[PDB]
Design a protein around this ligand. Sequence first.
Ligand SMILES: O=C(O)c1ccc(NS(=O)(=O)c2cccc(-c3cc(F)ccc3O)c2)cc1O
Ligand SMILES: O=C(O)c1ccc(NS(=O)(=O)c2cccc(-c3cc(F)ccc3O)c2)cc1O
Ligand SMILES: Nc1ncnc2c1ncn2[C@@H]1O[C@H](COP(=O)(O)OP(=O)(O)O)[C@@H](O)[C@H]1O
Ligand SMILES: Nc1ncnc2c1ncn2[C@@H]1O[C@H](COP(=O)(O)OP(=O)(O)O)[C@@H](O)[C@H]1O
Ligand SMILES: O=P(O)(O)OC[C@H]1O[C@](O)(CO)[C@@H](O)[C@@H]1O
Ligand SMILES: O=P(O)(O)OC[C@H]1O[C@](O)(CO)[C@@H](O)[C@@H]1O
Lengths: 432, 432
Amino acid sequence: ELTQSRVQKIWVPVDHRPSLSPTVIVMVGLPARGKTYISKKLTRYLNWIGVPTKVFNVGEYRREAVKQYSSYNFFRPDNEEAMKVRKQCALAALRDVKSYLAKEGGQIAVFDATNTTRERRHMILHFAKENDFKAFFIESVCDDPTVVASNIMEVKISSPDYKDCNSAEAMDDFMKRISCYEASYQPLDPDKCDRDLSLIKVIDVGRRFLVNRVQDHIQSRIVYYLMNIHVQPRTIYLCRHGENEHNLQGRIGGDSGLSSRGKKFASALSKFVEEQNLKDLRVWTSQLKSTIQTAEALRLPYEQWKALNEIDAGVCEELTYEEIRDTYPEEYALREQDKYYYRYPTGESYQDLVQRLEPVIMELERQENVLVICHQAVLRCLLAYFLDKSAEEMPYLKCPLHTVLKLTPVAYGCRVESIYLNVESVCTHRER
Amino acid sequence: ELTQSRVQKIWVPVDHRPSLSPTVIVMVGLPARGKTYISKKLTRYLNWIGVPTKVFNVGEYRREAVKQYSSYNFFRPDNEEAMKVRKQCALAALRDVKSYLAKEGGQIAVFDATNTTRERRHMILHFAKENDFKAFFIESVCDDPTVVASNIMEVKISSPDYKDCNSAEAMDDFMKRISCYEASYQPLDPDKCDRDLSLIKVIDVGRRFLVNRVQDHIQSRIVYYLMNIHVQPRTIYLCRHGENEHNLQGRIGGDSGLSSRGKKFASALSKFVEEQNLKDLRVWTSQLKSTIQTAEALRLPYEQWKALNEIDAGVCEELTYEEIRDTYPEEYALREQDKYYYRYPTGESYQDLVQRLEPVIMELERQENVLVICHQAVLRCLLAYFLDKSAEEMPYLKCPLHTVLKLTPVAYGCRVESIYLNVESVCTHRER
Ligand SMILES: O=C(O)c1ccc(NS(=O)(=O)c2cccc(-c3cc(F)ccc3O)c2)cc1O
Ligand SMILES: O=C(O)c1ccc(NS(=O)(=O)c2cccc(-c3cc(F)ccc3O)c2)cc1O
Ligand SMILES: Nc1ncnc2c1ncn2[C@@H]1O[C@H](COP(=O)(O)OP(=O)(O)O)[C@@H](O)[C@H]1O
Ligand SMILES: Nc1ncnc2c1ncn2[C@@H]1O[C@H](COP(=O)(O)OP(=O)(O)O)[C@@H](O)[C@H]1O
Ligand SMILES: O=P(O)(O)OC[C@H]1O[C@](O)(CO)[C@@H](O)[C@@H]1O
Ligand SMILES: O=P(O)(O)OC[C@H]1O[C@](O)(CO)[C@@H](O)[C@@H]1O
C-alpha cells in the first residue's frame, strides 16, 4: 500500500490508477538605496533553499525599450513622453510577473523598482489581489549622504546607463535623477495608512527594522534573512580538509585523519592564513577528524559544526565507488541520473545537505572574516549559494583538495579567486 | 595527537599536562502587557536550546519582602515608604542577576519588571556596563483595552496578590495599579533618545515590531523567536507512530512498517482526530514509514519532515539493546551514565536531536492546530521543550505507544492531558 520512491527514498501511497500560493515581493525606495542589491541577494537565497524565485527589474525593461540613456531629464516628473514609457514598462514587467507565478511554476516574484507613491503601490496591490498573489513590501530607507554617495560610486557610475561618462558627470546626473523621485515620495507608514500591509522597512543600512503583519512561513523566513545580512567588507575562505587516508584509497565518508600530504597542506594553510593577515578571523570546522586536524595547524581558535559534516552516504559509507557499483548497481545508476535529488539509503541527498546548511549560511551572513574547512559535497553546496549556481549544477562544482577559494562579496554578487597551496593530493572530482 | 572524547565523540587534542560574554535581557512595559509571559517563554526556549537562562522577577521579590498585598495604594507614586521597598527589591534582584551571570555559570538573565522610566533603564544600563554584561531590551506595548482586560482576567485575578478577592474587585484594583505607572511611562524611542540601545518593541500582540541594533548571534536568535510566537488559542497533539514491526522485536531505529496493532492504532487515531473536530489541523510526520502509514489512516493532508526522523543510532541501528550490550558493552555503559550527551558512533545524541528540532519548534510556534506523529526520542525532546523539562530529565520522559498527548498552551506554560486510545502495544520505556 505504500511504496518507497527510488531516487529520493520517500514513502508514498501506491497509485494503481495514475491515468487521471504565490507571492509578489514589492521593492520600495529612492534610487541608490540598495533595492537591486537586496532583490538579487534575497532571490539567490530563496532559489538556493529551493523556493523558485525571479527578479523583475523595471529599469532593465526601460533600457530594453529605449536604446541609449541620455540623462536625468528622462526621469523628470514633467516629462510627459518618458512617463508614458516608464508606466508601460512597469505594466509589462507586472505582466511577466503574472506569467511567471501563475503559469511557469515560480513561487516568488521580486518586483524591483522605486514604487515610491501610494498611487503606484495601490495599483500593485490591486494587481496581486486580482491574481491571488500575496504581496510583501521591502522598503529601503537611507538618510545618510555618505552611504548614498558610496553606493553611486560603487555600482552606478559603471552601469550601462553611464557608459560614456566620467565619475563627476555620472555622479552629478545621478543626484539629479534621485531628485526627480524625492518630491512625490511617500514612505511606507504602518502606523497610519499602511496599517494592513505586510512589510519590512530596512533602516540605517540594516541596523534598524520596522516589520508589520508577516503573513506566513516564507515571509517569516525572508524577514529573518534580511535582518541578518549586512554590508561590512569581509573575506570568506572555503577549503576542504587536507588530504585524508580515505581519499588515498578512493573511499567516501568515514572519519579518517590526514595523510602526510594533508599534514603538509595544513602547515601551508597556516602560513597562508598568517600572511593574509586578517582582523578577527573565525575558523569553522566540521566534527570530522580531517577538518579538525587541519584547523589545529593554524594555532587559532576554531568552532566545530555538526552541520558541516560531509554528506552522509548511508549504507555506502567507507566504500569505493567501484564497490558501490558492484554491490549496489541500481543505486549507483540512480545517483548518476539524478545526483542532486538522489538520496543514499539511510543517508542523504544534496537536497538534504542544503537544508542542514541553512543555519551555516545564516551565520555566515552574520559574520565578517571566516574560514570554513569542510568537505567536497558540503563545499559544493556552500559555493553554489555564494555563486548563484543551480541545483542541477551544484553536485558537479569543482572543489579540489589543497586549494583555498577566496570569496569577496561585491555588490550584486561574489568574486571568487582560487589559490592552490602547492601540495599534491588525489583528485576526487567526477564528471557527469 | 587528537583523541576522540568517549561520550560525545568529539575530536580533541590529547592533553599531556592537564595539571595547570553574558547578557541581561531587560523587560519594559506597563503591567498586564505580557512581560512575564514573554520572560518565562523565552527562558524556556533558551534553556531548551542549551543557553542557561534565568528569570528575575521584581514582583516575586516584593511578595517575599512584604507578606500580604493590600491594594494599589502600594503602587502609588506618592507612597514614599513603598517606593523605598520596591527600589530595594529591584537592586536585590539585580544583585542576584550579577551573581548568576558572573559566578554561577548562567549566560542570559531576564530582568522581569516594568522598567518604564529612562532614569531606571539608565541605572540598569550602568549596571550591565560596570559588570561587562550586554544589555538587550524587550518592550511590550499594548494599546488595546480588550487585550489588557482579557490579560487581567486570564492571569491577574487568580495570582497570589488577589487571593481574597472577587473578579470585579481585583480587576478594579488592577486598573488603578496600572494607572500608577501610566503618568511617568517613557516608551523606548530608538528614533531619538534610545538610538544606541539594542532592543525589540513588540506591538499589537506581536503583529508589528521595531528592532534596533542587534549585536550578536544570541540576540538575533531571540529576535527571530519573539517575532514568530503568537497567542492565538490552539491545540497541539503529539504521538508516536502506531506500533511497528521493530518494536515487537525490541529493535531500535530502522524503517519498519506498522504491526497489525499499529494499524489498529492508526484507525483509532483517525476516529479520535475526527471527533476532536478541529479547524485546519496540520498533520506532520517524519520520513520514516511507520509515521507515514499512521498519517494515511487519517485521510487528511500531511507534511513529512526529515527533521522529525527518530534519533540516529549509528552503528547500533536495527539492533536490540541486548545485542548492543553484548556487541558494544563499553558504548552501552557510557550511554547509561550520560544519556543526554552520549552520541552513538556515527550517530546522534539527544543533544544533536535538540538542534535538528530547532526548525520544528520554530514552525510549531508559528502554527495553530497541529498533530505531530513521530518517535520516542524525538517526542521526548519536543515534550521537554513544551513542559520546560531539563536536559538531564529529557531522555527519561515517558512517551508510550498508542497514546496522544494533548497540549493546551495556557499563560505561563502548558497543560498536558494524556489520552490512551485502547490498543495494546509493547512498552519501549527504559528507567535509569
Ligand atoms: O528606468 C528606470 O531606471 C526606472 C527605475 C524605477 C522606476 N520605478 S517605477 O516604480 O517602476 C515607476 C514607473 C513609472 C513611473 C514612476 C513614477 C516616478 C516618479 F518619479 C514619480 C511618480 C511615479 O509614478 C515610477 C521606473 C523606471 O523607469
Ligand atoms: O511589586 C511589584 O509587583 C513590582 C512590579 C514591577 C516593578 N517595576 S520596577 O521597574 O522594578 C520598579 C521598581 C521600583 C520603582 C519603580 C517605579 C515605579 C513607578 F510607578 C514610577 C517610577 C519608578 O521608578 C519601578 C516594581 C514592583 O514592585
Ligand atoms: N540597507 C541598505 N541601505 C543602503 N545601501 C545599501 C543597503 N543594502 C545594500 N546597500 C548598497 O546598495 C548598493 C547597490 O545599489 P542598488 O541596489 O543598485 O540601489 P537601487 O536598486 O536602490 O538603485 C551597494 O553598494 C550596497 O552596498
Ligand atoms: N505581545 C503581547 N501583548 C499583549 N499581551 C500579551 C502579549 N504576549 C502575551 N500576552 C498576554 O499576557 C498575559 C500574561 O500577562 P503578564 O505576562 O503577567 O503581563 P505583565 O508581566 O506585563 O504584568 C497572557 O494573557 C498573554 O496572552
Ligand atoms: O557527490 P560526490 O561527487 O560523490 O562527492 C561527495 C564525496 O566526496 C567526499 O567528500 C570525498 O571523496 C566523500 O566523502 C563524499 O561521498
Ligand atoms: O533513548 P532511548 O531510551 O534508547 O529510546 C530511543 C529509542 O526508541 C525508539 O524510538 C523505539 O524503540 C528507537 O528507535 C530509539 O533508539
